[PDB]
Every structure is written in structure tokens, then in C-alpha cells.
Amino acid sequence: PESADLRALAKHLYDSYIKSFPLTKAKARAILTGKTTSPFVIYDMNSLMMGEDKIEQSKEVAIRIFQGCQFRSVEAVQEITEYAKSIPGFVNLDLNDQVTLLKYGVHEIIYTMLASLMNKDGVLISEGQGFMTREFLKSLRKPFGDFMEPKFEFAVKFNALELDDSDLAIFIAVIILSGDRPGLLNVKPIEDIQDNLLQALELQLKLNHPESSQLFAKLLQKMTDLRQIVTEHVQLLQVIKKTETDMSLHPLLQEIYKDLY
């Protein structure tokens, strides 16, 4: 009885994802595979300088790149929040819980969506107008040369699952509606929404990837993996916090990170 409604839920989520996220995975992969009829490639210091206007004061390069990643993350947080608000039931949750879910969920979604922009050799930046090589990012002085490499490692494995935007819309919704975040006041309505989202995700994967038998189980495991990526990311931010003193942190990120893990 619920299958037709689970498809309407899937469609609603896809439509909402298209409204929320300017650069989709479909569009990103067309750029990455060279099948549009343009991105400026940044692969060393000279190309970085040249490309800066296609994509801060006079801080060192590693810090300026890190600052840029911060403003992009802030924009992503806003897009993700708009998307969360279109998940049926989410705006009716206690506002404290909406904040908690985003606080602890938005980095897992950022890494998910970053994989759509990545291949094994680099990452699209500035809504697809630039492409920064993985080797270039690895060449930055420590510890900045290490920030992105776990995300690339994650992305290559995750992209091998060949999810599309419709699949990702539901996957991201499931992660946001996690009833085990610390400090949630009312877990039951969250788990009730997430159970429906999980059924919608299983049906979506069986219909859209009928040859891929245990794809649902593989995605559940990717949810666990994302939590470890975000743990490793906070650890690195601690190393930075100490060693590096030229580090302003955008207020929105300050708010998210405060008492985060």
C-alpha cells in the first residue's frame, strides 16, 4: 500500500534537491568528463594566480585556499538547510532539534555532495568554473596538504556506486533525519520520518539499480563511513587551531563547531 506514496516522496525530494542545489551531480559529471559544449584548471602556483578571477589580504596560499573552502562550506550549509526544510515533517520538529540535526549532519552531507564534484584527479570549484588537481592540494604545506585527501579517498569509492541525483536526494534526507544525534529532545518523530525515508531509499535503489543487489546495505555503511570522515576532519581542525594563528573562522562555522564532537 505504501509503495506509490514512497515514490511520491522520492519525487518530492528530487524536485526539492533540484531547487536547493545549483550544481547537480548530473551537471558536474558532464563537466568532469569533458562533455559540455571551459573550467579553468589549477594545478600549480602560477595557474592558481592566473585562475583566481575565474574562481583574503596577503596571507599565505595554504590559508587562502582554506579560507575559500570555508566560504564555500558556509554557502553549502545554507543550501542544505533549505533542502532539509523541504523534507516532509522536518519544519514541524522542535526547532532545537532542527538545529541539532543540521549541526551534526551538515558536514556528512557536504562530504557526500563534494564526491559529486570529484574524480580521482581533482575537484570542481566555483560552481564548475574551476578544477583544482588533487596533486596540487597535496602539495600545500602541512597540515593543509592533508585536508582533502580523505575526502578524495571517500569520493572515489562512493562514486563507484554510480548513484544519481534522485538516489542522493533520499540518501541525504536519511542522514539529516538521524535520531542518534546528541541532545535531541524528541527522537521518536525523527525516527518515524527516517523510517519512511529508509523505506523510500530501499525502493528507489531496487527500481533505479535493479542489477545492484545489496546497494541499500552498501549505502547504510557509507553513512557510518561519513561519520568517521567528519571525526577525522574535526581532529585535523584541532591541529590547525593550535599551530596556526592566522586563522579566522566564519561565524556560522564557529557556531556549528562549538561543542561539536
Binding site: 522542535d94 538545529v99 543540521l102 556549528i256
Partner: peptide
């Protein structure tokens, strides 16, 4: 609410229409 009070900016984004 204690989370609400500690997250002024996330609250504003959530409230927005």
C-alpha cells in the same frame, strides 16, 4: 531553549521564508 540560544545563525536560516 538551550540549543536555540547557542545557534543564532542556524536559527535564522531555519526560520526564513
Amino acid at each position: 531553549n538551550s540549543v536555540x540560544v547557542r545557534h543564532x545563525l542556524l536559527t535564522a536560516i531555519l526560520x526564513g521564508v
